[PDB]
Structures are given as structure tokens and as C-alpha cells.
Design a protein around this ligand. Structure first.
Ligand code: GDP
Ligand code: MG
Length: 412
């Protein structure tokens, strides 16, 4: 029947708070995103909801589209044609969402801009998310008009107009607008069809060296003491490129922090892949797409606290520079994140202490020199630079709190 494969596409869900991202994700997948549980909390709150997509050939559209191995909803006893498993990226925070997208933490091959039909468009967060979408160059964008139930058939009209006008003269000039109610499960199939049409699975260079982004780490082992029965540490993450295998030898970068009297260094952590799993199904290899769990032979202490948070996984023999001093070609956002006002950002200065997030990593840095849009930065925690223009997000000290001011590309 329907096979069991890992997800092959990451689709980000963006849009202003209370507009219905989580509800939309639940509509498509049937999963309520976690782990926010009770509102709480540098841990990366990110929900990964998965589902398979299929087409009921014997049905017409959009009803032919299903997420379960049945076509009964269409009226056929045939089995649907499996297409692909999808992974959705959802966030509890607007700040968290911006930091994830701008730092290259939330790898997405396309996205979904959630827009409430009951609020004036575009809301501030909708704008900022749009700029974010543009910057990281996700062009496969579906704009979703949500909450169409609490609005007259003619108010969504006005909204659509506003959207299409907002997009004219931009790259999103031709991106579609699909109206639905996430809450009432209305016209969701159409959105699946659209997801199939405008957000296609990209070609992936199987040759490139394997890189995993560690977005979490932990200890599976239970409270009752195993006593030598202990399962090794598990690392959760997203694979950027290439493939990892079971039993494959890998290393964690930068790795273990060592301090020899004011002498700060990092030693790569070497281990073997004991297991791979997406969801609750086990696998043999792991490619880009979706959130993976990697069973290792690590001592569960090294991984217990999301301790290897902000790290990178590569093959053990891979030549990846772990840099202490980096160069960034940066840009300043027009608005400080989540702030109401205008041009309240000064370009980067001399001895300034910043907070840089490169991927899942977060470290303090000091600017040593600054050209125009070219800054040299010295870090308290080095960064594994696995490609040329990997991205970072920049925060400076304002009023006793870290505030995102810009973003940039690392250059070597
Ligand atoms: N009337 C209506 N309400 C909705 C719809 N979708 C979500 N809501 C409500 O909006 C609130 C915010 O939903 P949520 O999914 O948490 O939004 P997000 O996570 O901020 O995108 C929830 O209390 C829902 O009850 C919709 O399609 N119609
Ligand atoms: Mg939510």
C-alpha cells in the first residue's frame, strides 16, 4: 500500500499571531503543534507536523487529494496514488519565527503566508514575515486567506484586492491566494492541491557532503534507573544536504567546550549513528526534509539538556572550518523586530557587543572592524562554516534586552 518514507519537503507556515497558523497545520495534518504546552520560555520552540499526500485518481479535484490511504471521501474504493510526505514548520513566537528564518535554522523549501480575513492586511508581523520570506529567497509561496467563515463573502474580496496590490511590483506578484477556514475545515483540499502545484520537491544534490543542523538534543532514558541498560544520547535536527546512514561515523561541531585557565577551546565530538527515526518509524538513511531523530552512542550527559544545541553534524572525515573570527556582509532591517516605529537603527559600530545566531547556534560576539556593510566579528563560541554564504541573524543591546537589528552572510 502506501509506503513509509521520510518527509522530503519542508513547508514553513508564517503569518501574524491569532491568524491561524497552528489551526491550519492541524487542519492539514491532524496534529496540534508542540511543545508549547503551557506557554513557557535558548530552546527552539518549533512544531513539525507531518502528513502524506496522495491523489485519488478516480476522483476529480480538489477532492481527489487526501492525507490518508483511502479515497472514500471522494467516493472510490481504489487506493490513492502516494505522492510524498510533507513536513510543516510552525512556531509559537513571532520573534522565534524571525530568528529561525533569518539564521537558517528553519530550513524551508517553500512557505505558506497565513492572512486573517478579519484583520486589516497587512498586519505588522505579516509584513515582517513577508520581508523575511523575500530575504531568504523562498519563492514558492502560497498565500492563504484564513478565517473566511467570520467574514462576508465580499470582505474576502476586498482583502484579496489588497493582497494582489501589495504584491504588485514585487517578486510575490504572481503568488496565489487560497481562501479557507482552518477552524471549520473548509476548502482545505484546494490548499493541498496548491501545495502540490506551487511548492514542488526541489532537486537535491545527493553528492554534496552530509550536513545536519542540530535543533535539539536529549536523553531518552527513563527516570527509573536502567543501570547499564542505558540508551545513548539522541540528537534532533534538520539535514541541509547529502545523506546520513546508520552505523556511519560522524562528528559534532564545534563540539565539547574545554577551558584551561582562561584558554577557551572546542573539541569535535565523535560518534556513530545507532539509529535514525522520523516520527515514530525507524529508518536506515536520512536525507533533507523533515525533523530527524538520530540515536547515537553518546553519553546521554553530553546530550541531556539540549546541550549540543546550536551544533552541526557532519561525517567524521569532513573538512569543515570551525571559525573563531568571521566576516559578515550584513544588512539592516528597516524596523527593529516587533517594534512599532520607523528608522530607529544605527549601523554597526566599533567595540559593540552583539548576539549572533548562525543556524541553531547562539553566541556573543564583538565587532573588531567594520567597512561599509562588511563587519569582522570575534566570537565567544566558534561557528562551523560548512558553505560560503551561510546566514546569521544579528541582535544588539537595547534598553537592557537583546533586539534583532539585522542579518548577514558569513564570508570565507
Ligand atoms: N472563526 C475562525 N476562527 C479561527 C480560524 N482559525 C483560527 N481561529 C481562531 O483563532 C485563534 C488563533 O488560532 P491559532 O491557530 O492559535 O493561531 P496562530 O497559532 O497564532 O496562527 C484560535 O483561538 C482559533 O479559535 C478560522 O478559520 N475561523
Ligand atoms: Mg501557534
Amino acid at each position: 500500500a502506501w509506503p513509509k518514507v521520510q518527509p522530503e519537503v519542508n513547508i514553513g507556515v508564517v503569518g501574524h499571531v491569532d491568524h491561524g497558523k497552528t489551526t491550519l497545520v492541524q487542519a492539514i495534518t491532524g496534529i496540534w503543534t508542540s511543545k508549547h504546552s503551557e506557554e513557557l520560555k535558548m530552546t527552539i520552540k518549533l512544531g513539525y507536523a507531518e502528513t502524506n499526500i496522495g491523489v485519488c485518481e478516480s476522483c476529480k479535484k480538489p477532492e481527489a487529494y487526501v492525507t490518508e490511504p483511502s479515497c472514500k471521501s471522494c467516493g472510490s474504493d481504489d487506493e490513492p496514488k502516494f505522492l510524498r510526505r510533507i513536513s510543516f514548520i510552525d512556531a509559537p513566537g513571532h520573534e522565534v519565527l524571525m530568528a529561525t528564518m533569518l539564521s537558517g535554522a528553519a530550513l524551508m523549501d517553500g512557505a505558506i503566508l497565513v492572512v486573517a480575513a478579519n484583520e486589516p492586511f497587512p498586519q505588522p508581523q505579516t509584513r515582517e514575515h513577508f520581508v523575511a520570506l523575500g530575504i531568504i529567497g523562498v519563492k514558492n509561496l502560497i498565500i492563504v486567506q484564513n478565517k473566511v467563515d467570520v467574514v462576508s463573502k465580499e470582505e474576502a474580496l476586498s482583502q484579496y484586492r489588497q493582497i494582489k496590490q501589495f504584491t504588485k511590483g514585487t517578486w510575490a506578484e504572481n503568488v496565489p491566494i487560497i481562501p479557507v477556514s482552518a477552524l471549520h475545515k473548509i476548502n482545505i483540499d484546494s490548499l493541498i492541491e496548491g501545495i502540490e502545484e506551487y511548492i514542488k520537491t526541489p532537486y537535491r544534490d545527493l553528492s554534496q557532503k552530509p550536513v545536519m543542523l542540530v535543533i535539539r538534543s536529549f536523553d531518552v532514558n527513563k527516570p527509573g534507573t536502567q543501570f547499564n541498560e542505558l540508551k545513548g544520547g539522541v540528537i534532533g535536527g534538520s539535514i541541509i544536504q547529502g545523506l546520513f546512514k546508520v552505523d556511519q561515523e560522524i562528528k559534532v561541531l564545534p563540539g565539547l567546550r574545554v577551558e584551561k585557565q582562561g584558554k577557551v577551546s572546542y573539541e569535535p565530538i565523535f560518534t556513530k549513528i545507532s539509529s535514525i527515526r522520523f516520527g515514530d518509524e525507524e529508518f536506515k538513511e536520512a536525507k533533507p526534509g523533515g525533523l530527524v531523530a538520530i540515536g547515537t552512542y553518546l553519553d546521554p550527559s553530553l546530550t541531556k539538556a539540549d546541550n549540543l544545541l546550536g551544533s552541526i553534524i557532519t561525517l567524521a572525515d569532513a573538512e569543515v572550518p570551525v571559525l573563531w573570527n568571521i566576516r559578515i556582509k550584513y544588512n539592516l532591517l528597516e524596523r527593529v523586530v516587533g517594534a512599532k516605529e520607523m528608522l530607529k537603527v544605527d549601523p554597526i559600530r566599533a567595540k559593540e557587543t552583539l548576539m549572533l545566531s548562525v543556524g541553531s547556534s547562539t553566541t556573543l560576539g564583538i565587532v573588531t572592524s567594520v567597512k561599509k556593510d562588511e563587519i569582522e566579528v570575534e566570537l565567544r563560541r566558534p561557528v562551523a562554516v560548512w558553505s560560503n554564504n551561510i546566514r546569521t541573524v544579528i541582535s544588539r543591546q537595547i534598553a537592557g534586552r537583546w533586539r534583532m537589528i539585522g542579518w548577514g552572510l558569513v564570508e570565507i
